[model samples]
Target: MEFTEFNLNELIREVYVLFEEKIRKMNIDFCFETDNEDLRVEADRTRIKQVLINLVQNAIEATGENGKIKITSEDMYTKVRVSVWNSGPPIPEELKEKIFSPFFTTGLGLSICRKIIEDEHGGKIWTENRENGVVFIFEIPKTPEKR
Candidate 1:
């Protein structure tokens, strides 16, 4: 389905289910949290799902066995901020800026995700080395209304 035509929560739930399946296959501990109350964003739903899959998959790989991955979303007035965080090794500073560049990957899937979310959607995407682990964050702006 077109990104702008699908519900954000539904898309997110699909991605979550996919992640859960992958985690189960890998025998890893996985979890997710969200504060998005019927939050919807004007975006290409399929593309957003692709973005989420890429990020979550990357998180799973980084986490390895017995690790946890958390996906969260928060409404930010005019946009929604979605974050995929994993309890794994911290992202190196040198690799931070390059993570979103096309063809960039630290044995991870950040590059392709960047193309789908930022290059295609005209949105922002980034990652940061949090005190506990790392958080990959992206935004989907609310859809514009026609006059």
Candidate 2:
């Protein structure tokens, strides 16, 4: 796959805008935070966009009206990390590993997300349980080797 360097934050903003109207209509408090406005990463842009859309869509669906959905980006020097958090119940630990595999209830979206981040980008993706919510996070190397 041909990887290119692009502003990760910009892509997140673009994806947020893609769902902005829907988010507003649902009355969900959606927001995105980033430490840098110029954070760039080498990745398959289309695939990354697909993953972002899926994660954000899941967050929206899981959250109730007036709930919160947050997206954040941090530059970790060697790689960039992006997280999507929703004010929904935490995922059951028993289903954590299964969620990323093929044929889960969410179908293939997250499985594809895993393949793109881990297999194609040589990075990692995971989920975390917040005190009152669940967060899905992923990281991609700044300069991953091209295949």
Candidate 3:
């Protein structure tokens, strides 16, 4: 619930360390990329990591055999934009709206992710349908905006 200055590179590394083995076992090609290591944002690091991990898990499950998954991030000065993309069929146009409203699965992972980034962190969470699959993006302000 608390926000602090945090290094996204380090957090991204930790998430890879924890998930690499599992992703490997599933035969998914996972790529983690960063424009720079000094990207810092004010937020609960743990919450941000959870955001990536959850999207990644769902991404893996949705991916086709021998598919690929990529995690990318960049420092946008006033904001930080992170993206996770996986190869699979696009989420239906109609379901895209409901995907974040409730459960994509029986679990509440995506729903909670929406709340954490958008509500708690003053950011936006959403998905885009791509030709090959889907990309889930979470963009958050570097600092809370003036109300």
Among all windows of ten consecutive residues in candidate 2, which has the lowest summed lDDT?
138-147
The alpha-carbon lDDT assigned to residue 119 of candidate 3 equals 84
Clashing pairs in 1: 3-43, 3-44, 3-45, 4-43
RMSD of 3: 1.9
Candidate 2 lDDT tens digits, 4-117: 889999999999999999899999998899999899888889999999999998998888788899999999978889999999898999999998878788463899999999
lDDT of 1 by residue, 1-147 (tens): 364656566777788786677788777776656676578777777677778878887888888787778778887777778888888888789878776667674346667777766666666788888857899999756764310
Q: Write down the TM-score of every candidate.
A: 0.84, 0.94, 0.90
lDDT score, candidate 3: 0.83
The local distance difference test score of each candidate is 0.75, 0.89, 0.83
Question: Can you give the lDDT of residue 87 in candidate 1?
Answer: 83
| Ranking of all predicted structures according to TM-score, beginning with the best and ending with the worst | 2, 3, 1
Could you give the candidate ranking by lDDT, starting with the highest? 2, 3, 1
Best by TM-score: 2
Predicted candidate 3 versus true structure: per-residue lDDT over 10-82, tens digit per residue: 8877887887887888888989899988987778887888898888778888884587888889788788889
**Regions more than 4 Å wrong, model 2:** 106-108, 145-147
TM-score, candidate 3, is 0.90
Q: What is the lDDT of residue 105 in candidate 1?
A: 46
Clash number for every model?
A: 4, 0, 0
